[PDB]
Amino acid sequence: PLSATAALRDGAGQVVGSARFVQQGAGVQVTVDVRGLTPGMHGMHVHEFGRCTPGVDPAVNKVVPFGAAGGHFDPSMSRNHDTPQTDNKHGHGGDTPMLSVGADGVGKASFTSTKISLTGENGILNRSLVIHANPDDYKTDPAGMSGARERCGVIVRDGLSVRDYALPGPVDHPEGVAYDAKKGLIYTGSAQNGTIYAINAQSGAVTKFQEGGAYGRQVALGLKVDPQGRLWIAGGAQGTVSILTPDGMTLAVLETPKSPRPYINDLVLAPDGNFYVTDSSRPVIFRVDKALKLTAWLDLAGTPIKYGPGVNLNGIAATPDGKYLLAVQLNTGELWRIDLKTKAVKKVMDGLVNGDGLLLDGRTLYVARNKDQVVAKVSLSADYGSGQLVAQEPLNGLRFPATLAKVGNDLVVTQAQLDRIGGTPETPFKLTRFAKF
Numbered sequence: 548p549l550s551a552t553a554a555l556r557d558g559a560g561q562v563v564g565s566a567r568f569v570q571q572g573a574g575v576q577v578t579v580d581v582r583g584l585t586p587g588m589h590g591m592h593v594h595e596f597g598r599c600t601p602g603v604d605p606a607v608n609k610v611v612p613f614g615a616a617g618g619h620f621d622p623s624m625s626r627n628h629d630t631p632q633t634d635n636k637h638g639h640g641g642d643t644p645m646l647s648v649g650a651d652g653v654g655k656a657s658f659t660s661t662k663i664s665l666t667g668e669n670g671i672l673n674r675s676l677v678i679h680a681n682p683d684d685y686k687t688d689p690a691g692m693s694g695a696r697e698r699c700g701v702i703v704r705d706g707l708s709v710r711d712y713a714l715p716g717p718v719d720h721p722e723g724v725a726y727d728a729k730k731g732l733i734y735t736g737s738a739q740n741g742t743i744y745a746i747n748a749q750s751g752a753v754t755k756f757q758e759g760g761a762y763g764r765q766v767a768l769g770l771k772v773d774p775q776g777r778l779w780i781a782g783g784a785q786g787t788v789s790i791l792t793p794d795g796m797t798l799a800v801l802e803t804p805k806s807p808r809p810y811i812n813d814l815v816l817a818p819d820g821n822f823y824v825t826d827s828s829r830p831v832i833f834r835v836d837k838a839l840k841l842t843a844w845l846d847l848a849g850t851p852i853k854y855g856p857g858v859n860l861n862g863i864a865a866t867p868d869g870k871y872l873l874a875v876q877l878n879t880g881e882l883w884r885i886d887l888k889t890k891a892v893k894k895v896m897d898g899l900v901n902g903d904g905l906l907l908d909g910r911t912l913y914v915a916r917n918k919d920q921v922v923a924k925v926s927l928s929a930d931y932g933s934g935q936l937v938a939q940e941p942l943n944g945l946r947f948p949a950t951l952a953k954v955g956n957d958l959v960v961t962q963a964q965l966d967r968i969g970g971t972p973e974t975p976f977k978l979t980r981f982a983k984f
């Protein structure tokens with residue numbers, strides 16, 4: 548059972564109440580218990596950002612209490628304030644019913660809403676609940692004349708500890724992530740401009756490992772660190788695989804064949820010492836041997852993997868017994884097993900639509916499902932010929948999770964917001980570290 552809690556605080560930071568969110572179906576059972584308010588009806592809404600600090604209110608363009616919570620949660624971008632009964636396509640998903648405060652200054656509420664969820668596109672984990680000074684006329688934009696923000700609490704997933712690493716840029720869109728255990732460095736790359744950030748896993752300190760923009764370095768997708776500490780970078784529509792030295796210098800840019808519509812997506816270093824590289828547009832798997840010789844290792848046109856619209860093969864892993872590759876086809880949601888010795892291809896399972904980055908830990912496979920805003924967990928059979936979906940974790944809210952890396956006994960996932968590229972992402976961009984579940 549998914550559940551979350553917001554400790555509601557006043558302007559001075561004192562805890563004055565709490566709201567509880569419990570998943571029931573596709574909606575949420577909400578209870579609010581707060582004291583110390585003025586009696587009457589108070590606007591109450593789920594706001595887009597999980598920040599109960601001052602920030603700019605667009606109505607006056609000045610900093611206001613709880614302004615950093617942003618506007619009302621608006622998963623459909625309706626940009627229209629309406630009733631708690633309006634479908635999200637026409638009104639803010641965060642438009643919840645007003646809080647009634649009795650004469651003793653205590654507010655209680657208990658309602659169910661299908662406009663919000665703890666998972667998926669309507670998910671409100673790491674968003675916020677704001678109680679206002681005035682009543683909500685459920686009509687006037689942007690907030691129904693609810694006026695000043697009087698109480699606010701960040702919605703936090705119950706029973707789960709996570710750690711965020713925040714990035715500095717306005718369009719970072721971190722896509723790939725990798726980890727140098729000897730250096731204690733997390734690397735993450737920008738899908739937008741190719742910059743590689745370095746993150747000290749212990750302190751959280753962020754630096755630029757290498758600025759993007761040069762040949763083979765305009766886009767950075769899937770990332771891996773090899774035993775020598777070199778960073779391998781899938782190059783997207785550049786059609787390249789690029790390699791950086793531990794010092795941050797470009798060692799090589801490797802080209803794939805100049806056939807139309809390249810999209811080099813992700814990669815993995817198998818126990819055999821070879822890298823295997825997915826292309827989500829062209830039906831081919833590339834291999835880069837220890838000699839940095841890149842070949843078109845498997846033509847998928849003969850196999851049962853059929854390419855279609857959107858992203859095809861993308862996340863990829865190698866079984867630690869050296870026998871297979873596993874690769875997820877995002878658009879069909881199929882997980883494929885590829886025999887490294889014979890190049891035979893076998894469907895493992897389906898049910899993984901929007902499956903993106905893979906992370907294999909023995910017979911446990913973690914799968915970011917980007918549009919679904921979860922990390923799925925799959926249990927595989929010993930021959931890797933079949934699997935079962937055992938859990939889907941929204942953690943504490945994931946805005947388009949893309950790829951995964953092992954950091955000690957933890958995992959780290961990028962919140963890529965790739966569905967907002969060219970649009971209006973939330974800032975800061977962040978990576979999220981969490982225990983294997």
Ligand SMILES: [Ca+2]
Pocket residue numbers: 768769812813861862903904949950
């Ligand atoms: Ca990917």
Ligand SMILES: [Cl-]
Pocket residue numbers: 689690691692693694695
């Ligand atoms: Cl208002």
Ligand SMILES: [Cu+2]
Pocket residue numbers: 590591592593594619677678679690693
């Ligand atoms: Cu509000």
Ligand SMILES: [Zn+2]
Pocket residue numbers: 592619627628629639641642689690
């Ligand atoms: Zn609204």
